[PDB]
């Protein structure tokens, strides 16, 4: 089939690649069970302004992205850097929630690389940003004559002056109040401080498996190693940036890694 | 010695290439494969493959 | 004054092991052979800059130095960082305290935290709100200056404070040699040994032979 013939002359003809399949999947994590306070993030009694947006950091918990994913009470859900369905499985270094109310005519300004009177002076967005923003109008929560909302490097709070209040009237469409919330996800190569609802699992060694140490993916023969990791060291590496030991996040230990044998298949005939 | 060193240098730069973005949002293929829905992973992985 | 930081202040850049490799980096560092303002804490602690990561240092047998008031203005109008070590632990704050004119200890605000021969190198840098403090507690032998010899630095702390911090001021137990280097974006070629310890680092923004290295 590979020579395009019916008569194969005497020789040695490479044909394929034998790469041992992995046996099974192995998932390790730190045994933590805190719930990230997503309630106050989305059920805050009073949202900040576009110039005084709050930045409250969450950590050391688990985040159920589905129970917020199904939220139809919100007007928009657009995730730039990552596919929001996989958030429930993705887990990363940190999060940052920023809540504030805007007018309906500004939701397009909130995007990585966009501009506008809001997107530049008082709320710049990062260019390499990875994450997403959620939003919803608040015609029945903020507008009553709501004029207590003002506007003037990204995420700088610069707290005839440019001070100016938004004229909010419950009878407005684009002139309606709109509550917005954005999240930032920095996928550094670091010990993740938050992870989604992923249950830890057992560990097996000396067998091609699918190891997932806090998100570090790959397959190999997880043999025990004597690499003296000084207690501040998390991963290992090699000459050319190849992970070559890790630390089991659920219980400290240092074990080697080697990708199990592959190699082309030659056919003699 | 020079022959051997030339070949080792070539191999080493070849393998080092794997850790470069070339314009992608990452160089760890599985991340793009575990972060983006296919409608965009197509673009990213395309850049990396090129 | 001014003194000659011979080869001081090489800290483990990130949390990743290596072994037997000469891995170059590009991070904040203390350049080689620089001028560290040897301060006379005999029998002082003026306001000093915190520009882009203050290599601090000291060499004190009794830790007279026990305060580190960092910030922009240090006047309780903006969130003012504060560090204290009281005989057992490290104490961190953010709250706005109206301090006196001279930072000294006798011999809205949302975050709190708790936890010669004593060479104690440092580095106090800020990156994306992640305040950092590295360290090394070390036995050495010199009262004069920052001697020859080489020893790396581990990490100790990280904090996501996001404070607008421009300058700072050490705070002593006012009833001693302590210095203040400064850091800027160099590029090192640091060498690891078999056990995984940085035994020898080489700057190359310094001079030609270093660039050939």
Short mmCIF file of C-alpha atoms in Angstrom, two decimals:
data_model
loop_
_atom_site.label_atom_id
_atom_site.label_comp_id
_atom_site.label_asym_id
_atom_site.label_seq_id
_atom_site.Cartn_x
_atom_site.Cartn_y
_atom_site.Cartn_z
CA UNK A 1 0.00 0.00 0.00
CA UNK A 2 2.84 2.40 0.70
CA UNK A 3 4.97 1.57 -2.35
CA UNK A 4 2.04 1.81 -4.77
CA UNK A 5 2.84 -1.53 -6.34
CA UNK A 6 1.91 -5.17 -6.51
CA UNK A 7 5.47 -6.45 -6.82
CA UNK A 8 7.83 -5.46 -4.01
CA UNK A 9 11.44 -6.06 -4.94
CA UNK A 10 13.71 -7.51 -2.27
CA UNK A 11 14.61 -4.79 0.20
CA UNK A 12 13.79 -3.18 3.53
CA UNK A 13 10.96 -0.67 3.45
CA UNK A 14 9.97 1.46 6.42
CA UNK A 15 6.26 1.44 6.76
CA UNK A 16 4.79 2.93 9.93
CA UNK A 17 5.36 4.07 13.51
CA UNK A 18 4.91 1.95 16.61
CA UNK A 19 4.15 4.21 19.57
CA UNK A 20 2.86 2.46 22.66
CA UNK A 21 -0.57 3.66 23.61
CA UNK A 22 -1.07 5.04 27.12
CA UNK A 23 -2.70 2.70 29.59
CA UNK A 24 -4.87 5.06 31.62
CA UNK A 25 -5.45 8.55 33.00
CA UNK A 26 -4.03 9.80 36.31
CA UNK A 27 -5.24 13.02 37.92
CA UNK A 28 -3.61 14.53 41.01
CA UNK A 29 -4.52 17.76 42.77
CA UNK A 30 -4.19 19.52 46.13
CA UNK A 31 -6.95 18.36 48.46
CA UNK A 32 -8.76 21.67 48.91
CA UNK A 33 -12.53 22.23 49.01
CA UNK A 34 -13.24 25.95 49.44
CA UNK A 35 -15.92 27.62 47.34
CA UNK A 36 -14.96 30.85 45.60
CA UNK A 37 -17.38 33.62 46.64
CA UNK A 38 -19.01 33.99 43.24
CA UNK A 39 -22.26 35.00 44.93
CA UNK A 40 -21.07 38.44 46.03
CA UNK A 41 -19.25 38.77 42.71
CA UNK A 42 -22.61 38.56 40.95
CA UNK A 43 -25.10 39.35 43.75
CA UNK A 44 -23.46 42.55 45.02
CA UNK A 45 -26.05 44.97 46.36
CA UNK A 46 -24.24 47.94 44.82
CA UNK A 47 -21.88 47.84 41.87
CA UNK A 48 -18.92 50.17 41.49
CA UNK A 49 -18.54 52.85 38.83
CA UNK A 50 -16.53 52.71 35.61
CA UNK A 51 -13.80 54.85 37.19
CA UNK A 52 -14.01 53.15 40.60
CA UNK A 53 -14.54 49.55 39.50
CA UNK A 54 -13.57 47.10 42.23
CA UNK A 55 -10.77 44.54 41.87
CA UNK A 56 -11.20 41.79 44.47
CA UNK A 57 -8.96 38.75 44.14
CA UNK A 58 -10.18 35.21 44.76
CA UNK A 59 -7.92 32.25 45.56
CA UNK A 60 -7.57 28.85 47.23
CA UNK A 61 -11.00 27.51 46.34
CA UNK A 62 -12.85 25.69 43.57
CA UNK A 63 -15.03 27.42 40.97
CA UNK A 64 -18.05 25.77 39.32
CA UNK A 65 -18.17 27.41 35.92
CA UNK A 66 -21.35 25.58 34.90
CA UNK A 67 -23.62 27.15 37.53
CA UNK A 68 -22.59 30.54 36.15
CA UNK A 69 -22.47 29.24 32.58
CA UNK A 70 -26.20 28.53 32.51
CA UNK A 71 -27.01 32.07 33.71
CA UNK A 72 -29.57 33.41 31.25
CA UNK A 73 -30.29 36.47 33.43
CA UNK A 74 -27.17 38.11 31.95
CA UNK A 75 -27.15 39.88 28.61
CA UNK A 76 -23.79 38.76 27.22
CA UNK A 77 -21.19 36.00 27.67
CA UNK A 78 -18.17 36.23 25.36
CA UNK A 79 -14.88 34.50 26.23
CA UNK A 80 -11.87 35.58 24.19
CA UNK A 81 -8.77 33.69 25.27
CA UNK A 82 -10.37 30.34 26.06
CA UNK A 83 -13.43 28.26 25.27
CA UNK A 84 -15.74 28.87 28.26
CA UNK A 85 -17.08 25.32 28.18
CA UNK A 86 -13.62 24.01 29.11
CA UNK A 87 -13.31 26.32 32.14
CA UNK A 88 -14.90 23.57 34.23
CA UNK A 89 -11.79 21.52 33.40
CA UNK A 90 -9.16 24.21 32.91
CA UNK A 91 -7.47 25.33 36.09
CA UNK A 92 -4.90 28.05 36.45
CA UNK A 93 -2.92 30.41 38.64
CA UNK A 94 -5.33 33.18 39.61
CA UNK A 95 -8.54 35.07 38.92
CA UNK A 96 -9.55 38.73 39.07
CA UNK A 97 -13.15 39.93 39.10
CA UNK A 98 -14.05 43.51 38.15
CA UNK A 99 -17.67 44.67 38.52
CA UNK A 100 -19.19 48.01 37.52
CA UNK A 101 -22.24 49.52 35.84
CA UNK A 102 -22.13 51.11 32.38
CA UNK A 103 -24.54 52.39 29.77
CA UNK A 104 -25.79 50.03 27.08
CA UNK A 105 -23.78 51.82 24.40
CA UNK A 106 -20.42 50.79 25.90
CA UNK A 107 -20.45 46.97 26.05
CA UNK A 108 -18.61 46.83 22.71
CA UNK A 109 -15.75 48.92 24.11
CA UNK A 110 -14.96 46.06 26.51
CA UNK A 111 -12.79 43.85 24.29
CA UNK A 112 -9.05 43.11 23.99
CA UNK A 113 -7.70 45.84 21.74
CA UNK A 114 -10.80 48.04 21.49
CA UNK A 115 -11.05 51.76 22.20
CA UNK A 116 -13.56 54.48 23.08
CA UNK A 117 -14.24 57.12 25.71
CA UNK A 118 -14.51 54.35 28.31
CA UNK A 119 -12.07 51.80 26.90
CA UNK A 120 -9.09 54.22 26.97
CA UNK A 121 -9.18 56.88 29.68
CA UNK A 122 -10.82 55.10 32.62
CA UNK A 123 -10.80 51.38 31.74
CA UNK A 124 -8.04 50.13 29.44
CA UNK A 125 -8.08 46.53 28.54
CA UNK A 126 -4.97 44.37 28.16
CA UNK A 127 -3.81 43.35 24.70
CA UNK A 128 -2.60 39.84 25.60
CA UNK A 129 -5.52 39.32 27.98
CA UNK A 130 -6.91 35.81 28.40
CA UNK A 131 -10.35 35.44 29.92
CA UNK A 132 -13.75 37.02 29.50
CA UNK A 133 -16.33 39.56 30.58
CA UNK A 134 -19.96 39.05 31.58
CA UNK A 135 -22.65 41.71 31.65
CA UNK A 136 -26.34 42.46 32.07
CA UNK A 137 -28.59 45.50 32.10
CA UNK A 138 -29.94 46.84 35.39
CA UNK A 139 -33.00 48.86 34.37
CA UNK A 140 -34.92 47.55 37.40
CA UNK A 141 -31.95 47.57 39.82
CA UNK A 142 -30.08 50.86 39.26
CA UNK A 143 -32.32 53.29 37.37
CA UNK A 144 -35.13 54.60 39.56
CA UNK A 145 -33.00 59.04 38.20
CA UNK A 146 -29.73 57.27 38.96
CA UNK A 147 -26.97 59.87 38.58
CA UNK A 148 -24.47 58.59 41.17
CA UNK A 149 -22.26 56.94 38.50
CA UNK A 150 -19.30 58.89 37.12
CA UNK A 151 -16.73 58.45 34.37
CA UNK A 152 -13.46 60.15 33.51
CA UNK A 153 -1.80 51.08 31.31
CA UNK A 154 -4.79 48.75 31.72
CA UNK A 155 -6.58 48.45 35.06
CA UNK A 156 -5.14 51.74 36.33
CA UNK A 157 -7.57 53.46 38.71
CA UNK A 158 -7.03 57.18 38.09
CA UNK A 159 -9.17 58.02 41.11
CA UNK A 160 -12.71 72.00 34.00
CA UNK A 161 -12.71 68.49 35.37
CA UNK A 162 -13.65 65.43 33.28
CA UNK A 163 -16.08 64.39 36.04
CA UNK A 164 -19.48 63.68 34.52
CA UNK A 165 -22.46 61.66 35.69
CA UNK A 166 -24.53 59.26 33.61
CA UNK A 167 -28.14 60.22 33.01
CA UNK A 168 -30.00 57.01 33.77
CA UNK A 169 -33.76 56.81 33.33
CA UNK A 170 -35.85 53.64 33.70
CA UNK A 171 -37.70 54.60 30.50
CA UNK A 172 -34.58 54.24 28.33
CA UNK A 173 -32.87 51.40 25.17
CA UNK A 174 -29.15 52.01 24.75
CA UNK A 175 -29.30 54.61 27.53
CA UNK A 176 -30.11 51.95 30.15
CA UNK A 177 -27.81 50.97 33.03
CA UNK A 178 -25.79 47.82 32.39
CA UNK A 179 -23.93 45.87 35.07
CA UNK A 180 -20.72 44.32 33.75
CA UNK A 181 -18.22 41.84 35.20
CA UNK A 182 -14.91 40.73 33.67
CA UNK A 183 -12.51 37.93 34.66
CA UNK A 184 -8.79 37.64 33.93
CA UNK A 185 -7.00 34.29 33.66
CA UNK A 186 -3.21 34.29 33.55
CA UNK A 187 -2.11 30.80 32.47
CA UNK A 188 1.37 30.93 33.93
CA UNK A 189 3.52 27.84 34.46
CA UNK A 190 3.14 27.92 38.23
CA UNK A 191 1.45 25.98 41.04
CA UNK A 192 -2.22 26.67 40.42
CA UNK A 193 -3.91 28.29 43.40
CA UNK A 194 -7.46 27.66 42.13
CA UNK A 195 -8.84 24.71 40.19
CA UNK A 196 -12.30 23.84 38.92
CA UNK A 197 -14.50 21.01 40.19
CA UNK A 198 -12.00 18.32 39.20
CA UNK A 199 -11.83 15.39 41.59
CA UNK A 200 -8.38 14.12 42.47
CA UNK A 201 -7.59 10.52 41.62
CA UNK A 202 -5.09 7.77 42.34
CA UNK A 203 -1.61 7.36 40.88
CA UNK A 204 0.09 4.49 39.06
CA UNK A 205 3.72 4.09 38.11
CA UNK A 206 5.97 2.24 35.66
CA UNK A 207 3.33 2.31 32.94
CA UNK A 208 2.42 4.65 30.08
CA UNK A 209 -0.30 6.83 31.55
CA UNK A 210 -1.81 10.29 31.13
CA UNK A 211 -0.48 12.37 33.98
CA UNK A 212 -2.15 15.68 34.87
CA UNK A 213 -0.30 17.39 37.71
CA UNK A 214 -2.31 20.59 38.31
CA UNK A 215 -2.72 20.94 34.55
CA UNK A 216 0.72 19.80 33.39
CA UNK A 217 -0.29 17.30 30.72
CA UNK A 218 1.72 14.60 28.99
CA UNK A 219 2.38 10.89 28.95
CA UNK A 220 5.28 8.90 30.30
CA UNK A 221 6.52 6.24 32.70
CA UNK A 222 6.14 7.88 36.09
CA UNK A 223 9.08 6.31 37.92
CA UNK A 224 10.38 7.51 41.27
CA UNK A 225 13.38 9.82 41.13
CA UNK A 226 16.14 11.11 43.40
CA UNK A 227 16.28 14.64 41.99
CA UNK A 228 16.87 16.72 45.11
CA UNK A 229 14.11 19.28 44.69
CA UNK A 230 14.84 22.09 47.09
CA UNK A 231 11.56 22.85 48.87
CA UNK A 232 10.91 25.92 46.72
CA UNK A 233 11.14 23.93 43.48
CA UNK A 234 8.00 22.71 41.75
CA UNK A 235 8.82 21.22 38.33
CA UNK A 236 11.86 19.73 36.76
CA UNK A 237 13.34 20.29 33.33
CA UNK A 238 16.17 19.29 31.04
CA UNK A 239 18.63 20.60 28.44
CA UNK A 240 15.86 21.74 26.12
CA UNK A 241 12.77 22.55 28.21
CA UNK A 242 11.37 19.03 28.67
CA UNK A 243 9.57 18.32 31.94
CA UNK A 244 11.64 15.66 33.65
CA UNK A 245 10.14 15.31 37.17
CA UNK A 246 7.22 16.81 39.09
CA UNK A 247 5.81 17.01 42.62
CA UNK A 248 2.56 15.19 43.31
CA UNK A 249 0.32 18.05 44.47
CA UNK A 250 -1.80 15.84 46.72
CA UNK A 251 1.19 14.38 48.56
CA UNK A 252 4.75 15.64 48.18
CA UNK A 253 7.14 13.32 46.33
CA UNK A 254 9.58 13.58 43.45
CA UNK A 255 9.15 11.12 40.59
CA UNK A 256 10.90 10.96 37.23
CA UNK A 257 9.31 11.14 33.77
CA UNK A 258 10.23 9.49 30.49
CA UNK A 259 8.03 9.29 27.37
CA UNK A 260 7.55 5.65 26.64
CA UNK A 261 9.12 3.95 23.71
CA UNK A 262 8.08 4.64 20.16
CA UNK A 263 9.96 4.09 16.92
CA UNK A 264 9.28 3.39 13.30
CA UNK A 265 8.34 -0.04 12.02
CA UNK A 266 10.40 -1.47 9.19
CA UNK A 267 9.25 -4.43 7.09
CA UNK A 268 11.74 -6.89 5.65
CA UNK A 269 10.67 -8.81 2.60
CA UNK B 1 34.89 17.21 16.39
CA UNK B 2 33.49 19.94 14.18
CA UNK B 3 31.29 17.53 12.25
CA UNK B 4 29.82 16.14 15.44
CA UNK B 5 29.29 19.58 16.93
CA UNK B 6 27.59 20.91 13.81
CA UNK B 7 25.13 18.03 13.83
CA UNK B 8 24.43 18.40 17.53
CA UNK B 9 23.87 22.13 17.11
CA UNK B 10 21.43 21.54 14.27
CA UNK B 11 19.49 19.00 16.30
CA UNK B 12 19.41 21.29 19.31
CA UNK B 13 18.07 24.30 17.48
CA UNK B 14 15.54 22.06 15.76
CA UNK B 15 14.24 20.80 19.07
CA UNK B 16 14.34 24.25 20.66
CA UNK B 17 12.06 25.51 17.90
CA UNK B 18 9.21 23.58 19.52
CA UNK B 19 8.97 26.12 22.34
CA UNK B 20 8.33 29.16 20.12
CA UNK B 21 5.04 30.90 19.49
CA UNK B 22 5.52 31.86 15.84
CA UNK B 23 2.55 34.09 16.58
CA UNK B 24 0.42 31.60 18.48
CA UNK B 25 -1.14 32.24 21.87
CA UNK B 26 1.02 29.41 23.19
CA UNK B 27 3.62 26.86 22.25
CA UNK B 28 2.21 23.95 24.26
CA UNK B 29 -0.05 22.34 21.69
CA UNK B 30 -2.30 20.69 24.25
CA UNK B 31 -3.13 24.02 25.89
CA UNK B 32 -4.60 25.42 22.68
CA UNK B 33 -6.17 21.99 22.31
CA UNK B 34 -7.48 22.25 25.87
CA UNK B 35 -8.35 25.96 25.85
CA UNK B 36 -10.00 26.85 22.55
CA UNK B 37 -13.02 25.49 20.74
CA UNK B 38 -12.13 24.10 17.29
CA UNK B 39 -13.35 27.23 15.42
CA UNK B 40 -10.25 29.05 16.75
CA UNK B 41 -7.90 26.22 17.63
CA UNK B 42 -7.97 25.68 13.88
CA UNK B 43 -6.34 29.08 13.37
CA UNK B 44 -3.84 28.78 16.20
CA UNK B 45 -2.72 25.23 15.47
CA UNK B 46 -2.53 26.23 11.83
CA UNK B 47 -0.02 28.94 12.65
CA UNK B 48 1.98 26.55 14.82
CA UNK B 49 1.98 23.87 12.15
CA UNK B 50 3.19 26.30 9.51
CA UNK C 1 28.60 56.87 51.00
CA UNK C 2 29.27 54.20 48.38
CA UNK C 3 30.68 50.67 48.42
CA UNK C 4 31.44 47.94 45.91
CA UNK C 5 28.93 45.08 45.63
CA UNK C 6 31.48 42.49 44.57
CA UNK C 7 29.31 39.61 43.33
CA UNK C 8 26.32 39.90 45.62
CA UNK C 9 22.67 39.15 45.08
CA UNK C 10 21.96 36.24 42.72
CA UNK C 11 18.51 34.84 43.49
CA UNK C 12 16.76 31.79 42.10
CA UNK C 13 14.67 33.36 39.35
CA UNK C 14 11.65 31.04 39.14
CA UNK C 15 10.33 27.96 40.87
CA UNK C 16 11.64 25.44 38.33
CA UNK C 17 14.48 23.01 38.95
CA UNK C 18 17.33 22.36 36.50
CA UNK C 19 20.63 20.55 36.66
CA UNK C 20 24.03 20.90 34.98
CA UNK C 21 22.73 23.51 32.52
CA UNK C 22 23.86 27.06 31.79
CA UNK C 23 20.43 28.63 31.39
CA UNK C 24 20.41 32.33 30.53
CA UNK C 25 17.65 34.59 31.82
CA UNK C 26 16.47 38.16 31.51
CA UNK C 27 15.15 39.34 34.86
CA UNK C 28 15.61 42.07 37.44
CA UNK C 29 18.97 41.81 39.16
CA UNK C 30 21.76 43.63 40.96
CA UNK C 31 24.52 44.35 38.41
CA UNK C 32 28.01 43.28 39.25
CA UNK C 33 30.48 45.71 40.82
CA UNK C 34 28.01 48.46 41.65
CA UNK C 35 27.71 51.13 44.32
CA UNK C 36 25.56 50.26 47.33
CA UNK C 37 25.10 53.22 49.64
CA UNK C 38 26.73 51.90 52.81
CA UNK C 39 24.67 53.61 55.48
CA UNK C 40 25.98 54.43 58.95
CA UNK C 41 23.34 53.14 61.38
CA UNK C 42 25.79 53.88 64.20
CA UNK C 43 24.36 54.78 67.61
CA UNK C 44 19.73 56.54 60.85
CA UNK C 45 16.90 55.60 58.50
CA UNK C 46 16.02 58.31 55.96
CA UNK C 47 13.32 57.96 53.31
CA UNK C 48 14.81 56.00 50.43
CA UNK C 49 13.48 55.28 46.93
CA UNK C 50 11.67 52.06 45.99
CA UNK C 51 12.03 52.62 42.25
CA UNK C 52 11.76 49.21 40.57
CA UNK C 53 12.68 46.70 43.21
CA UNK C 54 15.02 47.66 46.01
CA UNK C 55 17.72 45.23 46.72
CA UNK C 56 17.92 45.78 50.42
CA UNK C 57 20.56 44.20 52.58
CA UNK C 58 21.99 44.36 56.06
CA UNK C 59 24.54 42.75 58.33
CA UNK C 60 23.42 43.00 61.94
CA UNK C 61 23.95 40.70 64.90
CA UNK C 62 20.76 41.66 66.78
CA UNK C 63 18.33 42.75 64.03
CA UNK C 64 18.07 46.35 65.15
CA UNK C 65 16.40 46.68 61.74
CA UNK C 66 12.79 45.67 62.33
CA UNK C 67 10.64 47.92 60.14
CA UNK C 68 10.04 48.39 56.45
CA UNK C 69 7.49 51.08 55.59
CA UNK C 70 6.87 50.88 51.85
CA UNK C 71 4.56 52.93 49.66
CA UNK C 72 4.08 56.11 47.67
CA UNK C 73 3.71 58.71 50.42
CA UNK C 74 3.77 56.79 53.73
CA UNK C 75 1.10 59.08 55.17
CA UNK C 76 -2.09 56.97 55.64
CA UNK C 77 -3.75 58.74 52.70
CA UNK C 78 -2.87 55.81 50.44
CA UNK C 79 -2.52 52.18 51.46
CA UNK C 80 0.87 51.97 53.15
CA UNK C 81 2.63 48.63 53.42
CA UNK C 82 4.24 47.74 56.73
CA UNK C 83 6.58 44.92 57.77
CA UNK C 84 7.47 43.97 61.35
CA UNK C 85 9.36 41.05 62.93
CA UNK C 86 8.61 40.66 66.66
CA UNK C 87 10.87 37.93 68.05
CA UNK C 88 9.06 35.08 66.28
CA UNK C 89 7.29 35.97 63.04
CA UNK C 90 6.80 38.23 60.05
CA UNK C 91 3.98 40.78 60.26
CA UNK C 92 2.42 42.47 57.23
CA UNK C 93 -0.33 45.09 56.94
CA UNK C 94 -1.91 47.47 54.45
CA UNK C 95 -4.02 49.77 56.61
CA UNK C 96 -3.58 53.54 56.66
CA UNK C 97 -1.62 54.54 59.75
CA UNK C 98 -0.74 58.15 60.55
CA UNK C 99 2.89 57.63 61.53
CA UNK C 100 5.26 59.95 63.33
CA UNK C 101 7.91 62.04 61.59
CA UNK C 102 10.68 59.48 62.19
CA UNK C 103 9.88 55.80 61.49
CA UNK C 104 11.15 54.02 64.58
CA UNK C 105 10.12 51.46 67.18
CA UNK C 106 11.03 51.78 70.84
CA UNK C 107 13.70 49.48 72.21
CA UNK C 108 -11.11 50.92 52.86
CA UNK C 109 -8.10 49.05 54.28
CA UNK C 110 -8.68 45.38 53.61
CA UNK C 111 -5.57 43.19 53.92
CA UNK C 112 -3.50 41.93 56.82
CA UNK C 113 -0.92 39.17 57.01
CA UNK C 114 0.99 37.22 59.65
CA UNK C 115 3.33 34.24 59.67
CA UNK C 116 28.79 41.10 61.17
CA UNK C 117 27.81 37.47 60.66
CA UNK C 118 24.12 37.40 59.69
CA UNK C 119 24.45 38.00 55.99
CA UNK C 120 20.86 38.60 54.95
CA UNK C 121 20.62 39.44 51.28
CA UNK C 122 17.18 40.32 49.93
CA UNK C 123 15.28 41.62 46.93
CA UNK C 124 11.98 43.51 47.20
CA UNK C 125 10.38 43.63 43.77
CA UNK C 126 6.86 44.20 42.46
CA UNK C 127 5.38 42.53 39.36
CA UNK C 128 1.69 42.76 38.36
CA UNK C 129 0.63 43.37 41.93
CA UNK C 130 2.61 40.34 43.11
CA UNK C 131 4.80 41.96 45.73
CA UNK C 132 7.78 39.71 46.38
CA UNK C 133 10.46 39.33 49.07
CA UNK C 134 13.22 36.85 48.50
CA UNK C 135 15.86 36.05 51.10
CA UNK C 136 18.69 34.07 52.57
CA UNK C 137 19.67 33.79 56.25
CA UNK C 138 23.37 33.17 56.20
CA UNK C 139 26.43 32.91 58.47
CA UNK C 140 29.37 34.96 57.18
CA UNK C 141 32.31 36.89 58.65
CA UNK C 142 32.76 40.58 57.83
CA UNK C 143 31.99 43.93 59.44
CA UNK C 144 33.69 46.08 56.78
CA UNK C 145 31.74 45.59 53.56
CA UNK C 146 30.03 43.26 51.12
CA UNK C 147 32.79 40.69 50.71
CA UNK C 148 33.90 38.33 47.97
CA UNK C 149 32.36 34.90 47.65
CA UNK C 150 29.16 33.76 45.99
CA UNK C 151 25.87 32.41 47.32
CA UNK C 152 22.44 32.31 45.70
CA UNK C 153 19.09 33.41 47.15
CA UNK C 154 15.86 31.44 47.56
CA UNK C 155 12.35 32.87 47.45
CA UNK C 156 10.30 33.33 50.61
CA UNK C 157 7.14 35.38 49.97
CA UNK C 158 4.61 36.57 47.40
CA UNK C 159 1.62 38.88 47.87
CA UNK C 160 -1.05 40.16 45.47
CA UNK C 161 -1.37 43.60 47.05
CA UNK C 162 -1.32 45.89 44.01
CA UNK C 163 -0.11 48.93 45.98
CA UNK C 164 1.22 52.04 44.26
CA UNK C 165 4.62 51.98 45.97
CA UNK C 166 7.23 54.53 44.95
CA UNK C 167 9.66 54.89 47.85
CA UNK C 168 10.19 53.30 51.26
CA UNK C 169 12.07 53.52 54.52
CA UNK C 170 13.78 51.02 56.76
CA UNK C 171 12.77 51.24 60.41
CA UNK C 172 15.21 50.24 63.13
CA UNK C 173 14.99 49.55 66.84
CA UNK C 174 16.32 53.01 67.65
CA UNK C 175 17.74 53.21 71.17
CA UNK C 176 25.55 48.86 62.30
CA UNK C 177 26.09 48.20 58.61
CA UNK C 178 23.03 48.12 56.35
CA UNK C 179 23.02 48.93 52.66
CA UNK C 180 20.66 49.67 49.79
CA UNK C 181 21.52 48.48 46.31
CA UNK C 182 19.30 49.05 43.32
CA UNK C 183 18.07 46.79 40.55
CA UNK C 184 17.45 47.18 36.81
CA UNK C 185 16.80 44.79 33.92
CA UNK C 186 20.10 43.02 33.39
CA UNK C 187 20.62 39.60 31.80
CA UNK C 188 22.54 36.83 33.55
CA UNK C 189 24.02 33.51 32.52
CA UNK C 190 23.62 31.54 35.74
CA UNK C 191 25.14 28.08 36.14
CA UNK C 192 23.64 25.14 38.01
CA UNK C 193 25.53 22.30 39.67
CA UNK C 194 24.69 18.62 40.10
CA UNK C 195 22.65 19.07 43.28
CA UNK C 196 20.76 21.91 41.60
CA UNK C 197 22.32 24.97 43.27
CA UNK C 198 23.41 28.10 41.41
CA UNK C 199 27.15 28.04 41.93
CA UNK C 200 28.30 30.72 39.51
CA UNK C 201 26.50 33.49 37.66
CA UNK C 202 27.79 35.68 34.86
CA UNK C 203 26.37 39.05 33.93
CA UNK C 204 26.98 40.14 30.38
CA UNK C 205 25.74 43.67 30.26
CA UNK C 206 28.97 44.36 32.18
CA UNK C 207 31.95 44.21 29.83
CA UNK C 208 33.10 42.56 26.60
CA UNK C 209 34.46 39.30 27.99
CA UNK C 210 31.13 38.84 29.72
CA UNK C 211 29.29 39.35 26.44
CA UNK C 212 31.52 36.72 24.85
CA UNK C 213 30.52 34.48 27.76
#
